[PDB]
Amino acid sequence: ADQLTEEQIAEFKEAFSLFDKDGDGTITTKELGTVMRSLGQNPTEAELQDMINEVDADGNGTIDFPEFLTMMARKMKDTDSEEEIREAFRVFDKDGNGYISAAELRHVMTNLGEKLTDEEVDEMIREADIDGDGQVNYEEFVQMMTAK
């Protein structure tokens, strides 16, 4: 694994940039909180600072890129408990009908401060949309989590 692939590095950049809202290279509690709220959580300031402290190896009070890689390494992997993707799916499936619509996905992107065209939203849906109905059902959401 000596070196990463560029596709891997790009994925990590994607992830980090989502949280680093102003693009300055560091994630603050303000930014962490703002994004978490968009994605369905409601952490307190103290909770956010505890999250930073766990991975703030240089003690400077904010999270840089390698610190963020460590944060993902510790919180994610996969495994362990699992099966509350239903809550994850619900952050998208805002009306609970079993299908993430284009308007629902745009709502999430709008909470995050992004303004997407219909084509860009459809492009996102095509990552998971096996049956071509322009929506992501739970089964499709589950498949997308284990694929590629």
Binding site: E14, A15, A88, F92, V108, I125
Partner: peptide
């Protein structure tokens, strides 16, 4: 810029950060 898969991963990540 962010893809749907990575966004759903970020939703999951946000939940794990809360102890869920």
């Amino acid at each position: 810029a962010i893809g749907f898969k990575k966004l759903a991963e970020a939703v999951k990540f946000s939940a794990k950060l809360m102890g869920q």
